[PDB]
């Protein structure tokens, strides 16, 4: 059983890093796009597909091992559990995380960052509601 | 406009990590919905995932504009050259240290299948690092 092992923690950290790598490389590719480096941009995009495969493989072992979602500590074995994990994370983000980030940005004197965090709190609330509707569809049959 | 040293800087970093994971998670969940025959759910997951891309990229915008470093590597990512240098730094850590160590631990804990996966990833990240090193030569030439 993977539960409680260092390998379980390493799969989680692997997933975090691969997730960031895909985002980072696609963001970098947009800079190459604008500056006129299509071969560099294309390489960044192709490497990013590698990082997708790596992240998804980590999630495969996590799920096969009975481990929980790195982002929420909720099970992700079935589709319903996956949607329940999405709801749990989104609910935390709109009710707690992004409002708290916005308050801190305001208190530190960064009103534009605070406004961004408030936009994201509203967006994650919308995401949460959409996922809640998906769960009603699945559990209702 | 200088965010260095603030709680808001750390919150942007943690926001980037979570949004990066959210996009990966939702696309992985969408593949399950695909297999089971829920195309409307899968398409919603994919569209919400695009939202999480926008959120992650916006966090990176504020990180770069605020004088902060890449969440994954603690290296500056202002210019395209710096972005590639950040990719190289992260990949180098992953192939020289991170994934080989994960593989050693997995074999020690009795997970040879997981260890083989980590060894495949160590080799893959070494290839990625070498491709990025070739790109940097092009940009700096
Ligand atoms: Cl090019
Ligand atoms: Cl459907
Ligand atoms: Fe969301
Ligand atoms: Fe890589």
From TrEMBL, chain A:
<feature type="binding site">
    <location>
        <position position="54"/>
    </location>
    <ligand>
        <name>Fe(3+) 1</name>
    </ligand>
</feature>
<dbReference type="Pfam" id="PF02915">
    <property type="entry name" value="Rubrerythrin"/>
</dbReference>
<feature type="binding site">
    <location>
        <position position="124"/>
    </location>
    <ligand>
        <name>Mn(2+) 1</name>
    </ligand>
</feature>
<keyword id="KW-0862">Zinc</keyword>
<keyword id="KW-0479">Metal-binding</keyword>
<feature type="binding site">
    <location>
        <position position="51"/>
    </location>
    <ligand>
        <name>Fe(3+) 2</name>
    </ligand>
</feature>
<dbReference type="InterPro" id="IPR012347">
    <property type="entry name" value="Ferritin-like"/>
</dbReference>
<dbReference type="InterPro" id="IPR052753">
    <property type="entry name" value="Rbr2/Nigerythrin"/>
</dbReference>
<dbReference type="GO" id="GO:0046872">
    <property type="term" value="F:metal ion binding"/>
</dbReference>
<feature type="binding site">
    <location>
        <position position="18"/>
    </location>
    <ligand>
        <name>Mn(2+) 1</name>
    </ligand>
</feature>
<feature type="binding site">
    <location>
        <position position="124"/>
    </location>
    <ligand>
        <name>Zn(2+)</name>
    </ligand>
</feature>
<feature type="binding site">
    <location>
        <position position="127"/>
    </location>
    <ligand>
        <name>Mn(2+) 2</name>
    </ligand>
</feature>
<dbReference type="GO" id="GO:0016491">
    <property type="term" value="F:oxidoreductase activity"/>
</dbReference>
<dbReference type="InterPro" id="IPR009040">
    <property type="entry name" value="Ferritin-like_diiron"/>
</dbReference>
<feature type="binding site">
    <location>
        <position position="90"/>
    </location>
    <ligand>
        <name>Zn(2+)</name>
    </ligand>
</feature>
<feature type="binding site">
    <location>
        <position position="54"/>
    </location>
    <ligand>
        <name>Mn(2+) 1</name>
    </ligand>
</feature>
<feature type="binding site">
    <location>
        <position position="51"/>
    </location>
    <ligand>
        <name>Mn(2+) 2</name>
    </ligand>
</feature>
<feature type="binding site">
    <location>
        <position position="90"/>
    </location>
    <ligand>
        <name>Fe(3+) 3</name>
    </ligand>
</feature>
<feature type="binding site">
    <location>
        <position position="124"/>
    </location>
    <ligand>
        <name>Fe(3+) 2</name>
    </ligand>
</feature>
<protein>
    <submittedName>
        <fullName>Sulerythrin</fullName>
    </submittedName>
</protein>
<feature type="binding site">
    <location>
        <position position="124"/>
    </location>
    <ligand>
        <name>Mn(2+) 2</name>
    </ligand>
</feature>
<feature type="binding site">
    <location>
        <position position="90"/>
    </location>
    <ligand>
        <name>Fe(3+) 2</name>
    </ligand>
</feature>
<feature type="binding site">
    <location>
        <position position="127"/>
    </location>
    <ligand>
        <name>Fe(3+) 3</name>
    </ligand>
</feature>
<dbReference type="InterPro" id="IPR003251">
    <property type="entry name" value="Rr_diiron-bd_dom"/>
</dbReference>
<feature type="binding site">
    <location>
        <position position="90"/>
    </location>
    <ligand>
        <name>Mn(2+) 2</name>
    </ligand>
</feature>
<feature type="binding site">
    <location>
        <position position="124"/>
    </location>
    <ligand>
        <name>Fe(3+) 3</name>
    </ligand>
</feature>
<feature type="binding site">
    <location>
        <position position="18"/>
    </location>
    <ligand>
        <name>Fe(3+) 1</name>
    </ligand>
</feature>
<feature type="binding site">
    <location>
        <position position="127"/>
    </location>
    <ligand>
        <name>Zn(2+)</name>
    </ligand>
</feature>
<feature type="domain" description="Ferritin-like diiron">
    <location>
        <begin position="1"/>
        <end position="141"/>
    </location>
</feature>
<feature type="binding site">
    <location>
        <position position="93"/>
    </location>
    <ligand>
        <name>Fe(3+) 2</name>
    </ligand>
</feature>
<feature type="binding site">
    <location>
        <position position="51"/>
    </location>
    <ligand>
        <name>Fe(3+) 3</name>
    </ligand>
</feature>
<feature type="binding site">
    <location>
        <position position="51"/>
    </location>
    <ligand>
        <name>Fe(3+) 1</name>
    </ligand>
</feature>
<dbReference type="InterPro" id="IPR009078">
    <property type="entry name" value="Ferritin-like_SF"/>
</dbReference>
<feature type="binding site">
    <location>
        <position position="124"/>
    </location>
    <ligand>
        <name>Fe(3+) 1</name>
    </ligand>
</feature>
<feature type="binding site">
    <location>
        <position position="51"/>
    </location>
    <ligand>
        <name>Zn(2+)</name>
    </ligand>
</feature>
<feature type="binding site">
    <location>
        <position position="51"/>
    </location>
    <ligand>
        <name>Mn(2+) 1</name>
    </ligand>
</feature>
């Amino acid at each position: 059983d993977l539960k409680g092992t260092k390998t379980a923690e390493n799969l989680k950290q692997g997933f975090i890093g691969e997730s960031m790598a895909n985002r980072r490389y696609l963001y970098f590719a947009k800079r190459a796009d604008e500056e006129g480096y299509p071969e560099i941009a294309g390489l960044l995009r192709s490497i990013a597909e590698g990082e997708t495969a790596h992240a998804f493989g980590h999630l495969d072992f996590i799920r096969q091992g009975g481990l929980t979602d790195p982002a929420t500590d909720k099970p992700i074995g079935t589709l319903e559990q996956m949607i329940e994990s999405a709801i749990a994370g989104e609910t935390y983000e709109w009710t707690q995380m992004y409002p708290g980030f916005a308050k801190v940005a305001r208190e530190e004197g960064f009103p534009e960052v605070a406004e961004w965090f408030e936009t994201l709190a509203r967006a994650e609330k919308s995401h949460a509601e959409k996922f809640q509707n998906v769960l009603k569809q699945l559990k209702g049959g």
